[PDB]
Structure formats: structure tokens, C-alpha cells
Write a protein of this length. Structure first.
Length: 138
């Protein structure tokens, strides 16, 4: 038998949260003597803006970011458990996160994202933990 009829087969995702408005900021590096505090980021001048698409399959969640005009992928961050290495919070305001976006080949970057309100950023952190609760043995 020969499996060589397939090679790119990532035609799967269970959607968890979608929002039309999210803004990216390239952040300074973490240290507990400063923290990520949202106000240190480029809140007046995003590096990119577009749409949120939190997705998952099995034990791996995917924070995908997508364009608001082209529908194309900007970036994606894969996550094995929440909280974990690929998702972080700020100190000052509950509407801002950081994620470890990856190219699927050992390339990575930490990018900051901001929401319109805390009551919508709560949906980012609830939709992640309400996927992982069984992996978290709750």
C-alpha cells in the first residue's frame, strides 16, 4: 500500500470564536520587572488589523488571524494546553493578549493582540478553556 496520494491534508478545524475586529502589535520582550502592560504596545498604530478565528482539533487549538478584505491567513498560533507557551495576558487591562504565532517549521514570533472591550476579550479566554477542560482533567 502507498499513502503518497496525500501530503497537504490540513483541511480540518473546529471553530470556537470569530470576531470581525482585532489589532496586532509587535511587543517588547517579557520580564517581570515590567510585564506586558498593553500601554507599552503600539495601541495608536497597529502593525496589522483584521479578523479573529479561534479554532481547534483534538488536543491542539489554533488562534488564527485573517484579513477583513481578502479572507487570507495573516498568522496562526498552535496551542497544546491553555494557559500555555503559545498564549499570554497583560497586567493592566483584560482586553489584550499575546500569542506565539508559528510557520509550522520551527519559526516563531510572539505578537500582541487587542480587543474593543473586556467583555469580548473574555470570549477569547473562555472559548479556549472550554475546549481544553477535558485535557485539564476538570
Amino acid at each position: 500500500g502507498s499513502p503518497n496520494s496525500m501530503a497537504t491534508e490540513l483541511e480540518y478545524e473546529s471553530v470556537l470564536c470569530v470576531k470581525p475586529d482585532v489589532s496586532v502589535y509587535r511587543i517588547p520582550p517579557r520580564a517581570s520587572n515590567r510585564g506586558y502592560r498593553a500601554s507599552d504596545w503600539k495601541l495608536d498604530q497597529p502593525d496589522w488589523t483584521g479578523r479573529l478565528r479561534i479554532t481547534s482539533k483534538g488536543k491542539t487549538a489554533y488562534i488564527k488571524l485573517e484579513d477583513k478584505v481578502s479572507g487570507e491567513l495573516f498568522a496562526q498560533a498552535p496551542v497544546e494546553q491553555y494557559p500555555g507557551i503559545a498564549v499570554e495576558t497583560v497586567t493592566d487591562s483584560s482586553r489584550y493578549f499575546v500569542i506565539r504565532i508559528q510557520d509550522g517549521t520551527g519559526r516563531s514570533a510572539f505578537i500582541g493582540i487587542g480587543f474593543t472591550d473586556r467583555g469580548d476579550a473574555f470570549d477569547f479566554n473562555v472559548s479556549l478553556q472550554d475546549h481544553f477542560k477535558w485535557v485539564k482533567q476538570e
